[PDB]
Amino acid sequence: EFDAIRIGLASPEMIRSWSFGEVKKPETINYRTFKPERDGLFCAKIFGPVKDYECLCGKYKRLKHRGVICEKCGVEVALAKVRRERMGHIELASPVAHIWFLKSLPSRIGLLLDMTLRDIERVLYFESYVVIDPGMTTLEKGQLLNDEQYFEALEEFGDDFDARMGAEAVHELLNAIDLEHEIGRLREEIPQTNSETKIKKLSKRLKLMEAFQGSGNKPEWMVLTVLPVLPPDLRPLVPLDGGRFATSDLNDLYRRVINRNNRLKRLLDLAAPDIIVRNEKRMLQEAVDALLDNGRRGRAITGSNKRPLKSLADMIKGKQGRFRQNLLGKRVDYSGRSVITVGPTLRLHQCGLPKKMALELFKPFIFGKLEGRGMATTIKAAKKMVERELPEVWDVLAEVIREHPVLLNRAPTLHRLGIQAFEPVLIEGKAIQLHPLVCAAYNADFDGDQMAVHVPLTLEAQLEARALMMSTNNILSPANGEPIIVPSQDVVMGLYYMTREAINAKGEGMAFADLQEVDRAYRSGQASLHARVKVRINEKIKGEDGQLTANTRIVDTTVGRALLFQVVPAGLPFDVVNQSMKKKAISKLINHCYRVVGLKDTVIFADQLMYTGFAYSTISGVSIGVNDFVIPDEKARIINAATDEVKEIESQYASGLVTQGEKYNKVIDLWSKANDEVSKAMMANLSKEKVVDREGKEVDQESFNSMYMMADSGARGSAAQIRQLAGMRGLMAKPDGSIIETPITANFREGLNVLQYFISTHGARKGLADTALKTANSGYLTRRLVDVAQDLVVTEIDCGTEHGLLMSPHIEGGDVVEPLGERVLGRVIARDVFKPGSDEVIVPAGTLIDEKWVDFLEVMSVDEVVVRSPITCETRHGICAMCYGRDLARGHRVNIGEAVGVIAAQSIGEPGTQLTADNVQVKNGGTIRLHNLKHVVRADGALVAVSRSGELAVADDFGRERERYKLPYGAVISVKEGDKVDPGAIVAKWDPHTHPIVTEVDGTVAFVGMEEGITVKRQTDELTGLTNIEVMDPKDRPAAGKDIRPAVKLIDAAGKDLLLPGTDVPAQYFLPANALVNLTDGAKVSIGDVVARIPQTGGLPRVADLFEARRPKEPSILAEISGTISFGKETKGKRRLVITPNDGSDPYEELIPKWRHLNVFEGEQVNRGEVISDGPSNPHDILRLLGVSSLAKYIVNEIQDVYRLQGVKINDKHIETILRQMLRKVEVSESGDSSFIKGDQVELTQVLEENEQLGTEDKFPAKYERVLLGITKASLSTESFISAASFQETTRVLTEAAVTGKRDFLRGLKENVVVGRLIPAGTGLAYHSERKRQRDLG
Amino acid sequence: ARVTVEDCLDNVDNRFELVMLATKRARQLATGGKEPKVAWENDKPTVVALREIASGLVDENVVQQEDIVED
Ligand SMILES: [Mg+2]
Ligand SMILES: [Zn+2]
Ligand SMILES: [Zn+2]
């Protein structure tokens, strides 16, 4: 019913309005009787009555007396609950300064009076004097007076002089602040200065003056003359067992202030001198200061207690405040918990609930059902029927839970699927019966785990549990498009054994007329579960639009595959069950079934797979024995051979042939080769060992082994675990990071030695102790991601924008690791894609790409698509519904009101617990196309590359790029452009050791200044191994010749001057150190002359440091303007990286350190997006030099590389959603229109550019530049102060919002939670929409 | 039977107005004495209100018209 919760300073006239009386005495209660004494901290006259509708005297103790107040000893008759609302006030005899507005990062009182923080603390303690209204005196208001300097002021001036000391002086300095006049003085003195050390000081002081003018807070209210008193029920004084009392830490603080305030009031009427009264007023300062906050310069009282104290401010801060303790947890009613238990007979939408828990959870619903049915007359008699557990109560409990869903949640709630709704059924026992299929989303095993229950009361919450939070609704993952409710290891084991073709079995070759004859033949024991038969099947096809046509055909399948087709819905063909039904094949069938037949026929199909998997996994009594871990007979021939190859190396180590490091890499790489040789020889004997007999033969089929089936079907176990059971274990690691020389040549079947078992304990406790950090670091990452993208919610249906980012498949390497099939599925196109022809489009407009459009794009040769993304949306205060897409638990696109920012932070933080160049060669065959690579053809028939911004691509015959390779500078190209490459042959060669050079033109070039005595040195190898011009180092040069550098002058053969086009200066490049000149002086090649040869962290903390946009330890150096770069002076200490732009006239000079080894040379033109020095690059300069399209490509592909290595997969919409909130603030480059030099939000900067353009001003010179903020700094930019006090410092955000009169609205999620209102996201959007159209309209 | 949450949500396709449309109808079947258009199959008014959404018997203007006749 309320809105716009505002906050400001409290005036002395308003503090008296909150109070109902003034406290004068410091006592609380009487010693004989436990009654609140008058005019004390506990007083029934000021506050409310103690007992319900009764005064202290007892003259009025009935309901008929409400406004009547007794005169002798009674109080105002109330409900005894107003003791939480009634307040008091203590009219202090001397003013006291507020420490919240004095001791902080900014000086709220110091900046307001142009005074120092230490100097104000000197006057408030009665040590120095200040002057009020100096005027015609000889001193300034900023000049203070001492005890010996103040006495002289009254002698020479006499008139026009007024000086005070203490808190009354600070209160007087704020009386004549001249608010309407001081701003006029700051406006005319700010543009005169030019140093940045004074701009940030005068502007920060100016912005505080306008805050005290529009908000209405007078500067006089910073010091208080009367303080409020907390209600007594908030600081309770309750007794304990044995007559002992227990009070709060605020009663003795309030008593200490009253004890000193009354002592000061009595010390003023006795005409006491200034020597004694100045110390009492000083004690009243720290008496009130210690009451407000603790930890400041005023040490809190500590008497007979260890902890210092708990003041008023300590109740809302310090990781234990009342505001922060409720944000992390709150006990609720109608709840309970118990252990979980598998129930294989339950449906997907129902769970098991004990009878003892249902009686307590649904207790109010039974009392109302017993009175309505006529079994009980009053609620007191109905309660006694439940305690006796009458038989008629069970018939009532069964009716109140028939259609009433309950909520189940596990303690670690990592993602959205941690809370699901089920229909409870009454079961006998004390354990909650859970469905086996919902165990994957809950991440719950049956090792004693507990699950909490909750009961929705209102029918508004019951409809949300059935339509939104039901277990059958969230069958797909919210992070991907894959089903999250899939058959686990026990169900996939029965479906794999059933569909497992055998060579020769009982009942092979027989024909069946229908699927009902197959079951009739199997149940009689006259046909094996898997035998090659031929059965006629009647199936229906949903491929036709709206036509469910039936087809009857004779297929060649097994007996088990025909029994599995009985549960398949009608819309799916038979070719979906003719495989071996592994885990990856069943999850793809449920996903395909969801997109064809819908949801109703899928929730009843996933239950049939669980019943069929549990039934056929029990008939086949699969078991693991001691003979299942078969050992290859050739394992002893590899271990004994590898042990002899190390003995011949240990003899070489004792002879001095190899070193310690050379022998280490020899024995480590030797055992790693023998470990892979045993693993490939074990899987060959384990998979193809089953032999059979068909009409007389020895045929090898797939192995029907228990250990092989559990790893092939994907139920449990992988190649790394079966390797340690049958094959050798291998080499173990070490907590230091090295590998031990002696490996573990034994497996777990044969057993390990005492030393081999102690070695394995190093990596065992390393992985167990790593899980303690995986739950502490990933939980801190998902919490920071929510605090940033919580306000983001779908609000608009259509933005109307055409901007979008280009999407291309990852063609890095040989094949595409992630094609355009899953990168574009579920995203609306931005621009119309065009065929290679003319006037022919594939998509008509921006359309939602579903599974039917993915194959339509795979048939065509379309490789690039422009899709919509939240990072490019134009919707202010929200995100468009068409820019998001349809990648969620639903099939359709996102609806209006869906909080897509919270499901994106939970999709990234959930899998966080699982986180920790000589030559090129074309792999496939196709055309070779080079982009952005300007080459110069030589005379021999080869190509030389001068730029590095491009790369080599392999064009398919259809017209799609499937291979991309990067080439360094000067890489010689063997093949030409536009020819058919050879799969397996080289196309270009490079030189990663020595960086080659390039020449622009041919001619007789010779080294100038190469005397071979100071600059260079003629080096000769053994047996004429080196005959060239070898350069020398700069340190080896002489002191006189260090200034001169060897340079090569390019001259033509005719003698004329040769100048490069587009540049005035010729091609004169100086040869650096450690270079070799292949061409002689006066003779060189026509092109491609190498004159000088220039010689040459992962896991969870990687993703956390990547969202923070931190600068790496060695940032890379990039170019700003596209032009010819050059060096500067090297003997000074730095490197002047001068560069002359060739297209524009704008020279820009920058400096570079010398410890960072540069990779660029002198005289080479570089582009804007080219890298100069190697090393990791921060995401900050890539946004300024390239733009926002290149930043969104680098961040997403770098985060996915950390998740794709571990196997998990997250959609790109969740990374671009968090990236939208980081690229939210903007910064202006020039000043004149903004207030300060810093930047503001882009939503406010865009709404002001339209009013200034189409208004009185013609142009818009106030431009801006995009900036990148981390998930820590972007969260601080919150206009609200209620939500900002949760994750930030409470005492810092309350003093800033008070002095500015910040009226906080409740248009967010985190604000409406602690306040108690509905959230704008979800079903609560209809409540906030029906109020906006009725408040600002009619 | 007749318990379909995806058939009623297929026409609106919002999953948020369906909860709001079924709320205004569930109170009429529980308070006021309004007779549902579908038969009572021993179901609570919370679930029997979703059958009228899937069958297309009630709508946004149908619930507003039935409640205005009582006032
Ligand atoms: Mg467990
Ligand atoms: Zn009385
Ligand atoms: Zn949009």
Curated annotation (Swiss-Prot), chain A:
Q: Which GO terms describe its biological process?
A: DNA-templated transcription
GO CC terms for this protein?
DNA-directed RNA polymerase complex
Binding sites annotated in the UniProt record for Zn(2+) 1? C55, C57, C70, C73
Binding positions for Zn(2+) 2?
A: C799, C873, C880, C883
Q: What is this protein called?
A: DNA-directed RNA polymerase subunit beta'
Q: Which gene encodes it?
A: rpoC
The protein's matches in InterPro entries, at most eight in alphabetical order, are given as: DNA-dir_RpoC_beta_prime (IPR045867), DNA-dir_RpoC_beta_prime_bact (IPR012754), RNA_pol_asu (IPR000722), RNA_pol_N (IPR006592), RNA_pol_Rpb1_1 (IPR007080), RNA_pol_Rpb1_3 (IPR007066), RNA_pol_Rpb1_3_sf (IPR042102), RNA_pol_Rpb1_4 (IPR007083)
Q: Does the keyword Signal apply?
A: no
Cofactor(s) listed:
Mg(2+); Zn(2+)
Entry's cofactor comment = Binds 1 Mg(2+) ion per subunit.
Similarity comment text for this entry: Belongs to the RNA polymerase beta' chain family.
Enzyme class of the recorded protein, top EC level: transferase
Q: Print the keywords alphabetically.
A: DNA-directed RNA polymerase, Magnesium, Metal-binding, Nucleotidyltransferase, Transcription, Transferase, Zinc
Q: What does this protein do?
A: DNA-dependent RNA polymerase catalyzes the transcription of DNA into RNA using the four ribonucleoside triphosphates as substrates.
Question: GO: which molecular function terms?
Answer: DNA binding; DNA-directed RNA polymerase activity; magnesium ion binding; zinc ion binding
Q: Which domain of life is it from?
A: Bacteria
EC number annotated for this UniProt entry: 2.7.7.6
| Catalytic activity field | RNA(n) + a ribonucleoside 5'-triphosphate = RNA(n+1) + diphosphate
UniProt subunit comment: The RNAP catalytic core consists of 2 alpha, 1 beta, 1 beta' and 1 omega subunit. When a sigma factor is associated with the core the holoenzyme is formed, which can initiate transcription.
From Swiss-Prot, chain B:
> Which BP terms does GO give this entry?
DNA-templated transcription initiation
**Listed EC numbers:** 2.7.7.6
Catalytic reactions of this protein = RNA(n) + a ribonucleoside 5'-triphosphate = RNA(n+1) + diphosphate
Q: Which UniProt keywords apply?
A: DNA-directed RNA polymerase, Nucleotidyltransferase, Transcription, Transferase
Q: Which domain of life is it from?
A: Bacteria
Name a GO CC annotation attached to this entry.
cytosolic DNA-directed RNA polymerase complex
Assembly and oligomerization: The RNAP catalytic core consists of 2 alpha, 1 beta, 1 beta' and 1 omega subunit. When a sigma factor is associated with the core the holoenzyme is formed, which can initiate transcription.
Return the similarity comment. Belongs to the RNA polymerase subunit omega family.
Protein name in UniProt: DNA-directed RNA polymerase subunit omega
Organismal lineage: Bacteria, Pseudomonadati, Pseudomonadota, Gammaproteobacteria, Pseudomonadales
Tell me the gene name: rpoZ
Q: Which part of the complete protein is shown?
A: 2 to 72 of 88
